[PDB]
């Protein structure tokens, strides 16, 4: 419990002083042009008013460069404060 | 499962009525073995 | 209030914003509690 509040402000440390990291919009800048759902406002092809559908995304984690880089949103909700095996490398997780 | 959507179709939604044109021939294909019994009666009354 | 479902402009519930917030429904039940294992998402339900 206590280690789940010590990750609590791991994000908000890490973004200035690791640099970089950003969590933008799941909705992305190109706009092309929205395909087809049976007639708008429906929940077999959407969320229902909710959202849209366009393209293959899903991306939601991914960092700018814009004309200079380190840019980071001010407040994240994306995945919980839990606590499990111990894995302190990525390659070390994609074997376990 | 049917479409859950965050924003995508480009695969999802295609694809599905694609599979399911896929299916659909290959059931008769499969079935057709079994169909041979009413062939053999079918070409036995236009030979009569 | 309920013998009607889809007629193809389907929402089953979204929040009331208005023109203003600081707004909401007065029938805020539709829904019994109940008491169940630890889940702190939805995601952790599903693997339930």
Redesign the interface.
Same mark, same amino acid.
């Given at each position: 419990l206590n280690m789940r509040a010590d990750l609590e402000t791991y994000v908000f440390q890490d973004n200035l002083a690791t640099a970089m990291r950003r969590d933008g919009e799941i909705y992305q800048s190109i706009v092309n042009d929205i395909y087809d759902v049976p007639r708008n406002v429906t929940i077999t092809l959407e969320d229902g008013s909710e959202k849209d559908v366009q393209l293959m995304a899903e991306v939601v984690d991914l960092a700018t460069g814009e004309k200079q880089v380190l840019n980071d949103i001010r407040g994240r909700y994306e995945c919980y404060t839990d606590v499990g095996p111990s894995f302190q490398s990525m390659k070390q997780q994609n074997r376990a | 499962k049917k479409?859950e959507?965050?924003?995508? #179709? #480009?695969?999802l939604?295609e694809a599905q009525q694609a599979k399911q044109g896929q299916q659909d021939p290959a059931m008769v294909q499969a079935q057709g073995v079994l169909l041979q019994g009413q062939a053999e009666l079918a070409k036995a009354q236009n030979q009569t």
């Open positions: - | 479409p959507t965050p924003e995508e #179709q #480009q695969w939604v």
